[PDB]
Design a protein around this ligand. Structure first.
Ligand code: CLA
Ligand code: CLA
Ligand code: CLA
Ligand code: CLA
Ligand code: CLA
Ligand code: CLA
Ligand code: CLA
Ligand code: CLA
Ligand code: CLA
Ligand SMILES: CC(/C=C/C=C(C)/C=C/[C@@]12O[C@]1(C)C[C@@H](O)CC2(C)C)=C\C=C\C=C(C)\C=C\C=C(C)\C=C\[C@@]12O[C@]1(C)C[C@@H](O)CC2(C)C
Ligand code: SF4
Lengths: 41, 35, 67, 165, 80, 197, 734
């Protein structure tokens, strides 16, 4: 477990996790707010 | 004043063939000039 | 001879050599030669240079305390 | 009505562009039966286009001579014509997020150096420590200006690696 | 040919001579280092400037320096 | 020797102690060098006297009902008849420009060739005919009063310049407008001083 | 060994290789590195070389005048400056075919001629030249001047005529004389010639050397000048309905302030330019006697340099010690001169197209495009030359013990901060410009172009509204009569300038949109990045962390080998050679912007540029693809039009670009081994080993390879863009 956790603690794996997290957040924001351009509350 | 009509027929071959040929001949003798 | 020609071994030093890779850097004194060579202060550095080495010999006048 | 430009709602080229887009979407839609998934997909695309064109209007956006909306970047001018939400608020938000990133990275750099082999912590990330610093960066400007005040944000020129002249 | 200059920061580790592919350097007795050896270049006319001696130098910066200039038949590595 | 403080409890300046008109000030730490300090002293005194004279002219051109100070040089756009309390002097613009340039140049040359650091700040002698500066305490308090009234003069001149840049009304009209309707009419109602009011 | 060709280098003479030839040419005029060279001999060689360059320049312009007069249509272009095209030089090529000869007969000529795009026709029409005999005598006089300058260089090279070292180092007298004589009285004589000739010639009056000292330029006759009534010269200016060639609508005015353009020819007034040059001459003369000569008055350069030091240690020692730094180091003066001249020609390029000074120049679109592109490329080249010679100054002649604590020592102390801030601003500009362009391209690709980000350039629009452009609206100066700027000069130059700036036909303060904003930020990115590369090369020239002893290796050395991870392209010469690529990209950007905006203005489809420059598909398709249709059709199996030569040199430029890629990508080891194999092949063959090489063939040096690749790259770049620009602007216009 802890060896696999340290493998998951390596830089490419946590970078991949950040990549999926940020991409999914931005994609869901764009999907539920279709095409915004100007901040208007 | 005005150059004759045969001037393009003489100066252009002179500076396109003869003058570069003598220039390369002089430069080739100058490159390989030894003591 | 009296005391020692250089700093205490194992103590941190700051390299004042301008042409060195470790200028204004902190290193550890490994050993100081007592025969009288020009650069007796052997300093080991945590970060390697472009050549990959981490140790160098410096004279007495190019080492100070870590500020 | 700044820079010799008209609002998107009052403009004619904006409505012409919207009409052209609706026309080509309807031309693509007419090739499919109403009881098919591409028909619903194109209807959703048309609805999204209409919603976007409605939201771009009545929001202060203005377009000049082509129907494509323009953005005013000078503060003050954007403040007195309700164009601050175009770039002024987003630039402040991006500065906030970028300072969050910088503060989190600085905290991880500093907090992973007082240990044996800091490069090992750099290459294999301390995930609980990284998450703790991630959730502690919400007050990045306060900590940044406080580190500036106490002088720990900047290093003196005596401990800084410097190239020969 | 090229100029090979050796300074007093050399520790006499003999790595530059082993890295030399044309037998330019040599080891002479010395008293300024712990190993009592100093690098010399008595055959600098045969050096081509490959800078292989500079790669093997363990000291910071370089205890041996090669400066190019005035290339000859031996310095250009020509078999013809 | 300190005559007051621009902010009660501020950091005292170790070099700005033996200064006439000592009100601490200097938050930007300018003039720490003594030579720059005395240069700033003489420059401030000269600006004080010039703003003194300018405020005098601006007030005297208005309290006598002779016209606006900004409209005073308006006779020189194309060539008209100047006047001074109804004197109608016949002087061309070139003659007055030349004589003013020459007089100011020789006066500044004499002031620069004074070569006495105490006298550059305060010459005395021929410039003091009444001779009330012989008493040192009276000299000190009159120096303080001159500095205070000169500072008021320069801030009043800056106020006149800003007011005439913002609105076309003269000084007395602005004073009457503030007296009659202070809340309904002030610097915040100009629309150009504060971008957004 | 020891051949006599590199007489300036004894070490290069004893080099039995072909490289001795190449290094015998690249190091030809680097006299500081020559053997047995003194400072006086270096100064004498510099003086002779300067006289030689002046003679070459005068011979070149004499040849231009002669080839415009002979085999040209200067008089026909003078009669009709709108329709018929200028002729540069006739073509005599025996390799030409009969359809190629017939297709190149343009402009009413008897043979194949080249349409002139240098613009000397408009300039010589503006200055007053009308007849071919005037051009002939001007060309022969300039040839005599060039011969005189060459003989002068030879004589000043000769013994008992060489100037002293202190003569060259006399900075004060040289500065005073070149400020007062080279600029002051030269401009005074030029504006005198303008008043005497060009204004009468633009008013239909012939003024020549035969009738000189007889015709009065002004009917008053110099008496208002002595009486002080200089306003009498600006009494009767030329009317709006004035013909440049004739005397219709003429006037009597030689110096005025008629700001704007002549309505008939769309150019600046001759009287305005004469007044400008007279004022410039007066300002130069009144400022040309400021420095301290042998007389008791003047200004010492060193005194002002040393006295200008800020108090409280703002700049440390200040500007002290810079006098000896400038005087001793010639590369510092070279860098300053090249930078100032580059800024000058950049200003020239940016001010010709907006304010055309020559009659019938704005109508000639190809001429204006070629002139702007040439001036911008020359400007970028000598910008880079200024920075490179500054790096040469930092490597060769820079003593930190002399200028200790000065501005140079300070900027060398914190060079890392400057390089880091320039790198940050380059990354910032590039990231955001590329992100905006890619966002716009993706948005336009998805069929919904209204989602693209169009940041309106409000700063430049506010400036132009503050300078008279009422298109953007607003209520700043020069747009509202209540402003003091509008009230001042209301009857001097404002009525003409406002009319010139409110017209959309000319190139004076054109409409600037979001695409113009994006390309302007791209230009800023290019300039800041090239500046970053050049100042990193100059500041790290004499040393760095990878090479502290970079001063001992000279300015142009290949590398230090594969040690310390790799040290290739570490000299300041390599930084300059990368900055050449970046400068080429930046000038390509500015010329693409200029060409596309002006082409859309001339075609009348300004909206196409407004809605097409936002995204890079518009740049590739509406500019690089739509306007290249006439270029590529210069020669085809169907036939040939007049743009065959432009298509041929376009393909030629692409080919030289490819050869530059050849000399830049592949490096020395492969070619050296291949040359060794070829040497064996030539050695071990019958009937060919009887001959032999006097010098051993070797591969080109790494620095030499970089230079050759740079030269091929720049030649291909220049030829390709010149071909495309001239073919696109001349194939559909005239
Ligand atoms: C009224 C008060 C006053 C003020 C405002 C100044 C201000 C100034 N004086 Mg000074 N001066 C004063 C009083 C004053 N002085 C007095 C009392 C004296 C005694 C008589 C002098 C005598 C004096 C001399 C003799 C000289 C000055 C100079 C200067 C200038 C440079 C100062 C300096 O060290 O650089 C500022 C401090 C620095 C550390 C410089 C940092 C510069 C940074 C690194 C550059 C950043 C560039 C950046 C990339 C820009 C980005 C913009 C982007 C668009 C590109 C500065 C404008 C010098 C001058 O003429 O220069 C114009 C000069 O030679 N002064
Ligand atoms: C058109 C081609 C091109 C491009 C885009 C670049 C881009 C760059 N070069 Mg340049 N360069 C080129 C050709 C090019 N080079 C050539 C042919 C030469 C001659 C050899 C040079 C010589 C040169 C020098 C001498 C220097 C640069 C520098 C730079 C940087 C400038 C900073 C900037 O503008 O912000 C960055 C802008 C960019 C467009 C960079 C690309 C980044 C985009 C956004 C992609 C990023 C990744 C993206 C998210 C996708 C991720 C997934 C993907 C990785 C699979 C940047 C990295 C300078 C430098 O290092 O800066 C300090 C520098 O000193 N270059
Ligand atoms: C660096 C320049 C730049 C800028 C300023 C923008 C800015 C924008 N683009 Mg663009 N884009 C860029 C580069 C850029 N993009 C590039 C390089 C590409 C190609 C990969 C795209 C491709 C692209 C598409 C395909 C779309 C956008 C959209 C958007 C919007 C952001 C929507 C979003 O993320 O949800 C908002 C998310 C947040 C506000 C995050 C909030 C997180 C916490 C709460 C804070 C905004 C107008 C979308 C849009 O609405 O169009 C107008 C859209 O459809 N862009
Ligand atoms: C710029 C100088 C210059 C000049 C004036 C010429 C002139 C000529 N070349 Mg050209 N040529 C040049 C440079 C030049 N060349 C260069 C630099 C190249 C290499 C790129 C060539 C490659 C080239 C080829 C491949 C051919 C020519 C041919 C010709 C001839 C044209 C056909 C003709 O009239 O029959 C020749 C008539 C004569 C009266 C000449 C005979 C008398 C000679 C000089 C003795 C003509 C004499 C053609 C030719 O000569 O055919 C055999 C031909 O096929 N040329
Ligand atoms: C250096 C960059 C820059 C530039 C070129 C401009 C340019 C402009 N600003 Mg802006 N401004 C800027 C930065 C900048 N601003 C910043 C950083 C702020 C503070 C957030 C402001 C705050 C500001 C206000 C409050 C106002 C302007 C206004 C203006 C306009 C006229 C300014 C003037 O003196 O008259 C002009 C479009 C004025 C305007 O809109 O025109 C009347 C105005 O009222 N600006
Ligand atoms: C979070 C760490 C961090 C921090 C605080 C900085 C801070 C700085 N960098 Mg650096 N940089 C970093 C990482 C970092 N950098 C990395 C990883 C790279 C390699 C790609 C660079 C490459 C780089 C260059 C080439 C330059 C800078 C410059 C700068 C300065 C300008 C600010 C800026 O946004 O530049 C822009 C910085 C970037 C575009 C790099 C962003 C790299 C990624 C996207 C961020 C990584 C965040 C990291 C994963 C957070 C870790 C948190 C932890 C819990 C896991 C500033 C001093 C500039 C300078 O000298 O200014 C004076 C400059 O020219 N940086
Ligand atoms: C005022 C102008 C001026 C002056 C007086 C100098 C003078 C000098 N420079 Mg500088 N320089 C200048 C402008 C100037 N340069 C410009 C504008 C640039 C930018 C391009 C440079 C870039 C530069 C570098 C990078 C270096 C110099 C060097 C030199 C020295 C060598 C000159 C010599 O004798 O060798 C004569 C040199 C040659 C004959 C080589 C010229 C070869 C050219 C590139 C070929 C032409 C291109 C192309 C093939 C033409 C044909 C086109 C085709 C279509 C037909 C000398 C001190 C060198 C130096 O100081 O040595 C350390 C050096 O390293 N300069
Ligand atoms: C008022 C007198 C006077 C005038 C008109 C000139 C004119 C000239 N000198 Mg100068 N010179 C003078 C006095 C003068 N000199 C004195 C007194 C000295 C000694 C202190 C020198 C020392 C000197 C040197 C050392 C050099 C010149 C050079 C030049 C030429 C510069 C190129 C040019 O015309 O730029 C054209 C400018 C525009 C069109 C603008 C030009 C012909 C240079 C040369 O030989 O020619 C290149 C050069 O290297 N001069
Ligand atoms: C097989 C592919 C190929 C290749 C490799 C080349 C190679 C070349 N062509 Mg050619 N071309 C080809 C096919 C090809 N061509 C074909 C089939 C056509 C159609 C007839 C053309 C049409 C063409 C034209 C019309 C031009 C070239 C040019 C060039 C040169 C590139 C100049 C350069 O490096 O500047 C680097 C690139 C740039 C500076 C700009 C790139 C173009 C962009 C899209 C313009 C927009 C830039 C703008 C400022 C915004 C971007 C900002 C940024 C921050 C994002 C080079 C000789 C140009 C030339 O000779 O030199 C200028 C030129 O004008 N070519
Ligand atoms: C001399 C002067 C005015 C002169 C006026 C004259 C001749 C007027 C003449 C005329 O009007 C008449 C009579 C009649 C008109 O018809 C014609 C004219 C010709 C117009 C004003 C000075 C005016 C001077 C002014 C306003 C000075 C302001 C100073 C400031 C703001 C100082 C700032 C700092 O204090 C901080 C903030 C923080 C500290 O750390 C640092 C420092 C630098 C000390
Ligand atoms: S330039 Fe060539 S020999 Fe030098 S370090 Fe680079 S690859 Fe190696």
């Amino acid at each position: 477990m802890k060896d696999f956790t340290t493998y998951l603690s390596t830089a490419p794996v946590v970078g991949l996790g950040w990549a999926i997290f940020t991409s999914g957040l931005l994609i869901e924001i764009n999907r539920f707010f279709p095409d915004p351009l100007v901040f208007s509350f | 004043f005005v150059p004759p009509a045969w001037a393009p027929s003489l100066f252009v071959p002179l500076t396109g063939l003869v003058l570069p040929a003598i220039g390369m001949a002089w430069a080739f003798t100058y490159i390989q000039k030894e003591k | 001879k009296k005391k020692e020609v250089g700093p205490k071994r194992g103590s941190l030093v700051k390299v004042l050599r301008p042409e060195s890779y470790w200028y204004n850097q902190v290193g550890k004194v490994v050993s100081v030669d007592q025969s009288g060579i020009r650069y007796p202060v052997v300093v080991r550095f945590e970060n390697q240079n472009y050549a990959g080495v981490s140790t160098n010999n410096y004279a007495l006048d190019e080492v100070t305390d870590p500020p | 009505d700044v820079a010799g430009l008209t609002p998107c709602s009052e403009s004619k080229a904006y409505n012409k562009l919207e009409r052209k887009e609706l026309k080509t979407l309807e031309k693509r839609l007419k090739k499919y039966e109403p009881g098919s998934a591409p028909y619903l997909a194109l209807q959703a695309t048309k609805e999204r286009t209409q919603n976007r064109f409605k939201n771009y209007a009545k929001a202060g956006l203005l377009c000049g001579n082509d129907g494509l909306p323009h953005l005013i970047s000078d503060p003050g001018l954007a403040l007195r014509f309700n164009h601050a939400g175009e770039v002024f608020i987003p630039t402040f938000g991006f500065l906030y997020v970028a300072g969050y990133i910088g503060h989190v990275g600085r905290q991880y750099i500093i907090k992973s150096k007082e240990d044996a082999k800091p490069t090992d912590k750099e290459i294999i990330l301390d995930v609980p420590l990284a998450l703790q610093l991630a959730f502690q960066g919400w007050a990045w400007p306060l900590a940044a200006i406080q580190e500036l005040r106490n002088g720990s944000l900047l290093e003196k020129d005596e401990n800084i690696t410097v190239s020969p002249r | 040919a090229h100029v090979v200059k050796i300074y007093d920061t050399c520790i006499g580790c003999t790595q530059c001579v082993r890295a030399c592919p044309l037998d330019v350097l040599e080891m002479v007795p010395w008293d300024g280092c712990k190993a009592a050896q100093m690098a010399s270049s008595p055959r600098t006319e045969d050096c081509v400037g490959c800078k292989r001696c500079e790669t093997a130098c363990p000291t910071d910066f370089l205890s041996v320096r090669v400066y190019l200039g005035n290339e000859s038949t031996r310095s250009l590595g020509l078999a013809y | 020797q300190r005559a007051g403080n621009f902010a009660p409890g501020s950091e005292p300046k170790e070099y700005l102690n033996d200064l006439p008109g000592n009100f601490n000030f200097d938050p930007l730490e300018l003039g720490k060098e003594k030579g720059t300090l005395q240069r700033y002293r003489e420059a401030e005194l000269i600006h004080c006297r010039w703003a003194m004279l300018g405020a005098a002219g601006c007030l005297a051109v208005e309290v006598l009902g002779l016209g606006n100070w900004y409209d005073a040089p308006l006779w020189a756009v194309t060539g008209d008849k100047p006047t001074w309390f109804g004197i109608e002097v016949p002087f061309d613009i070139a003659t007055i420009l030349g004589v003013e340039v020459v007089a100011m140049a020789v006066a500044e040359g004499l002031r620069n060739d004074n070569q006495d650091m105490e006298k550059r700040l305060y010459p005395g002698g021929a410039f003091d005919p009444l001779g009330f500066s012989k008493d040192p305490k009276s000299f000190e308090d009159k120096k303080l009063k001159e500095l205070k009234n000169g500072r008021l003069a320069m801030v009043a001149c800056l106020g006149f310049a800003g007011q005439h840049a913002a609105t076309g009304k003269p000084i007395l009209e602005a004073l009457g407008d503030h007296l009659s309707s202070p809340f309904f009419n002030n610097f915040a109602t100009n629309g150009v001083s504060v971008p957004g009011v | 060994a020891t051949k006599l060709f590199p007489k300036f280098s004894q070490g290069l003479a004893q080099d039995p290789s072909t490289r001795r030839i190449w290094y015998g040419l690249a190091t030809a005029h680097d006299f500081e590195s020559h053997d047995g060279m003194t400072e006086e001999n270096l100064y004498q060689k510099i003086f002779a070389s300067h006289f030689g360059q002046l003679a070459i320049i005068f011979l070149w312009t004499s040849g231009n005048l002669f080839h415009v007069a002979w085999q040209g249509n200067f008089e026909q272009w003078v009669t009709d400056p709108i329709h018929v095209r200028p002729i540069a030089h006739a073509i005599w090529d025996p390799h030409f075919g009969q359809p190629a000869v017939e297709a190149f007969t343009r402009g009413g000529a008897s043979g194949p001629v080249n349409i002139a795009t240098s613009g000397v026709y408009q300039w010589w029409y503006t200055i007053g030249l009308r007849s071919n005999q005037e051009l002939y005598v001007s060309s022969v006089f300039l040839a005599l001047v060039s011969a005189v300058f060459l003989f002068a260089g030879w004589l000043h090279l000769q013994p008992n005529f060489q100037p002293s070292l202190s003569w060259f180092k006399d900075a004060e007298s040289r500065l005073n004389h070149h400020l007062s004589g080279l600029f002051g009285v030269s401009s005074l004589a030029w504006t005198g010639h303008l008043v005497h000739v060009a204004i009468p010639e633009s008013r239909g009056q012939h003024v020549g050397w035969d009738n000189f000292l007889s015709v009065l330029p002004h009917p008053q006759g110099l008496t208002p000048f002595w009486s002080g009534n200089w306003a009498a010269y600006a009494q009767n200016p030329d009317t709006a309905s004035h013909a440049f060639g004739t005397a219709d609508g003429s006037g009597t005015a030689i110096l005025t302030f008629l700001g704007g353009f002549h309505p008939q020819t769309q150019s600046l007034w001759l009287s305005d330019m004469a007044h400008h040059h007279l004022a410039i001459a007066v300002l130069f003369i009144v400022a040309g006697h400021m420095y301290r000569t042998n007389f008791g008055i003047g200004h010492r350069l060193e005194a002002i340099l040393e006295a200008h030091t800020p108090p409280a240690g703002g700049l440390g020692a200040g500007h002290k010690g810079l006098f000896h730094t400038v005087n001793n180091s010639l590369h510092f003066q070279l860098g300053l001169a090249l930078a100032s001249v580059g800024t000058i020609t950049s200003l020239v390029a940016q001010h010709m197209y907006s304010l055309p000074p020559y009659a019938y120049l704005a109508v000639d679109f190809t001429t204006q495009a070629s002139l702007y592109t040439h001036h911008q490329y020359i400007a970028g080249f000598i910008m880079c030359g200024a920075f490179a010679h500054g790096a040469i100054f930092f490597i060769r002649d820079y003593d930190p013990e002399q200028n200790k604590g000065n501005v140079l020592a300070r900027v060398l102390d914190h060079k890392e901060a400057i390089i880091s801030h320039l790198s940050w601003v380059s990354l910032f500009l590039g990231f955001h410009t590329l992100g905006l362009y890619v966002h716009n391209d993706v948005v336009q690709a998805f069929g919904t172009p209204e989602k693209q980000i169009l940041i309106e350039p409000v700063f430049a629009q506010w400036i132009q509204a503050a300078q008279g452009k009422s298109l953007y609206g607003f209520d700043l100066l020069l747009a509202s009569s209540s402003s003091s700027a509008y009230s001042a000069g209301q009857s001097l130059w404002l009525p003409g300038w406002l009319e010139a700036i409110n017209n959309n036909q000319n190139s004076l303060f054109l409409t600037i949109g979001p695409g113009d904003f994006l390309v302007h930020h791209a230009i800023a990115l290019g300039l800041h990045t090239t500046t970053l590369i050049l100042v990193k090369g100059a500041l790290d020239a004499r040393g760095s962390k990878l090479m502290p002893d970079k001063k001992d290796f000279g300015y142009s050395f290949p590398c230090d080998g594969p040690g310390r991870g790799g040290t290739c392209d570490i000299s300041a010469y390599d930084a300059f050679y990368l900055a050449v690529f970046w400068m080429l990209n930046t000038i390509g950007w500015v010329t693409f912007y200029w060409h596309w905006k002006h082409l859309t203005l001339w075609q009348g489809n300004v909206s196409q540029f407004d809605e097409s420059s936002t995204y890079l598909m518009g740049w590739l398709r509406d500019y690089l693809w739509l306007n290249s249709s006439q270029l590529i059709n210069g020669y085809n199996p169907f036939g040939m039009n007049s743009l065959s030569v432009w298509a041929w040199t376009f393909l030629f430029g692409h080919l030289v670009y490819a050869t530059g890629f050849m000399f830049l990508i592949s490096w020395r080891g492969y070619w050296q081994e291949l040359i060794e194999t070829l040497v064996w092949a030539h050695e071990k063959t019958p009937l060919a080993n009887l001959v032999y090489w006097k010098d051993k063939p070797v591969a080109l040096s790494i620095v030499q390879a970089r230079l050759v690749g740079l030269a091929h790259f720049s030649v291909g770049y220049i030829f390709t863009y010149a071909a495309f620009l001239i073919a696109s602007t001349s194939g559909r216009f005239g």
